[model samples]
Target: SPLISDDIDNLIRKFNSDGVLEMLTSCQANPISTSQMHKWMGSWLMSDNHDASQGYSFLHEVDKEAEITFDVVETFIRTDSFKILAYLCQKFLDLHKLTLILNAVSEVELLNLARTFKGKVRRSSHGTNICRIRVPSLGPTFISEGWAYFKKLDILMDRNFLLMVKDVIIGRMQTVLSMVCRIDNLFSEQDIFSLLNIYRIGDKIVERQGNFSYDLIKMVEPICNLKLMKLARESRPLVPQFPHFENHIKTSVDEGAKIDRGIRFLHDQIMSVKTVDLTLVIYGSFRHWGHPFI
Candidate 1:
């Protein structure tokens, strides 16, 4: 079932303070409401507190929007509306339009063109679900009695690996963005310093100053390599699983188990990132900072 509206309401309630602030700032059609802004300002002055919950609310909003956009894109693809596909491609440059063209064009004469264009399309963010599509009923239907189960398990693990990579990439990008903005110091120095420290901690702060850009890129390389290694390992297991999947529905148990393993591997990889020693790091020295009272 879809999430209930009341569930969203409860989430908003939990997201107090900035809950209202965000709406005023981002959702305002014309001039933002001064009263609402003043209300938060006054509260800040009197209580010297701000709710962090609103940030979660903003995340939820983004997730919800992405979900809607994904569905809309899928629907447009299924409908074969080339115009809509073109529009959507423009709207979400993240999706490869050429892939859609290849997928849309007629077969036979379009075969070579499709293959060429397909090569240009990056794999789906969700990973390619490519397989010989078949639905199976109950029991050990057609697969060989022995290794089929294990193969299915391996296929499931591969899917989990892709998900893990996606999540890690998202996390790393967010951290990078926060770090860049921190160093930019559009906000106060205190806020900037706080963000910088968090980014340094997340990146395991090998080098902060020699060349910030190169250092940042270097930090990301190992993480990308780790994720890539995971992807390769998971992919290896699934190659044999393809054939056995045609057998039956009960094989799903094996698939689920394999996915659990992949999830564990992902957890281990993320946890393995060593924490940077703050005292030894240059960024750590700036922990002490003062922000003027307004």
Candidate 2:
């Protein structure tokens, strides 16, 4: 049998008729876990024929009337039973319902929520830490685990929350990259692919940083080169090259030289080409350049 029985459905109907729903919603803190609150709401949803628009209307009404404080909301977010946070997020995604829960919370509360909901860090048996992300099961076709939380972060009008999310993601990238550096054997072609995925987030990060932002992609270039070197030694085919990798080497060689000189120098020594193809060959040679082992 379902947990929301006919009796519970009737009780929920009565609560709605008698203003118990309004009363509970308006209160600062209800003596119920967020999960339990979600269960009760689920019963209400089952009893009523309300559609997505009606659901949004109800949330807007609650937002206007609720005397709930940021402190209380923060507590609910931090509590063990707050899986409702993610549950409501999934609901919001499906119903297109906009709620004031995020708007009502303060900057600090929003930051807390971002931190709490972001992927968790756990230590391996060998004393290395790795990120464990909690992906919401939003049916099939939703590939990214961080997508739901990212959506929640996007809806918030708070700039700080967005910045906090960026910071958290970058921190995770650094952690994972450091781990990659520590275990030489563990680094594989797939790890480089994962790093490229992280690089995709660079545009978002750069957008937030005014006119001039630190080039993080450049900072991680060495790791890419290191991986390329590893592949070269084993006589394995290199992964598809990042254009920035070639640019990094070009810039590092001589500040006074023209860009074409760098390309020509790269072509002659590494490419070993009497006639340059100039398209695919340039990138291929860049990966194989340096390290006599290749």
Q: Point out the worst 10-residue segment of candidate 1 by lDDT.
A: 141-150
Q: Which stretches of candidate 1 lie over 4 Å from their true place?
A: 1-50, 78-294
RMSD of each: 28.5, 24.0
Clashes of 2: 0
Query: lDDT values of the candidates?
Result: 0.28, 0.31
What is candidate 1's CA lDDT for residue 124?
20
lDDT of 1 by residue, 106-225 (tens): 434233543543322222223321111111111111111010111211111112222222233334334323433332334333433433333333232212111122223222233334
> How do the predictions measure up, each by TM-score?
0.19, 0.20
Candidate with top lDDT is 2
Tens digit per residue, CA lDDT, model 2, 1-294 = 112223333433454452223322222212332123222221321122323343345445544554355456658878221122223333443322111213314534433433554533333344322222332322111101111122211111122322333333334333333433342344444443333333333333233331122232232234334344534544655555556866765455343123223222322233231222212222332211111100
